Amino acid sequence: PSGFNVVIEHDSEYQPDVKVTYYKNSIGTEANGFDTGPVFGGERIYNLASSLSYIRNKINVELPSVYAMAGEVVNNGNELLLINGTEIMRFVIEGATITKGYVEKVKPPTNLIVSDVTSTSAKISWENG
């Protein structure tokens, strides 16, 4: 929909910052085993532009739809890693500890409309995320 959304659950009662990077063939992600890639340690690191929004204990990292990828989620507490083969999308939190992280699958409803409103009732209608 709006984009590709990665949820980061943390222990802060506030709004931790998140910095997103992307890189291929870092140590342990090479297809033919350790150091079988074209640039040992990892190829070009790209900074990914994110739009962040917050609720208590949950950061929602909205990235452009073009970056959308599958993959294993690794939680290292200081950083979250979205590993898809050779590709890694790295999320670095500031001022909190990552509790759990995941690509948002169950997404919140959207076009909320109040119709047929009377003194005693109203009808709420929406659209799936």
Next chain:
Amino acid sequence: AELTKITRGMQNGAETINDNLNKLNTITVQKTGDETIAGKKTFSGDVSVDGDFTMKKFADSYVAFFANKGSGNTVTFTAPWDCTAEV
């Protein structure tokens, strides 16, 4: 020890890491096994040896004897180090 720098994009990364780990493992003094350590080793703090301690030329570098040959009445000498005398 002279280790070879590990950089992003390097060739022979696995072998250079292996050689460096092997270099460190064979040059370092470890908390187990029998070893031989070369070089002048100066210890800042306290040192205790629970096992058998063994040293070279003890009597020469700790015990010094100075006596007057021609008279035997007065001994005059330049102290080799800081010490306790037994006249």
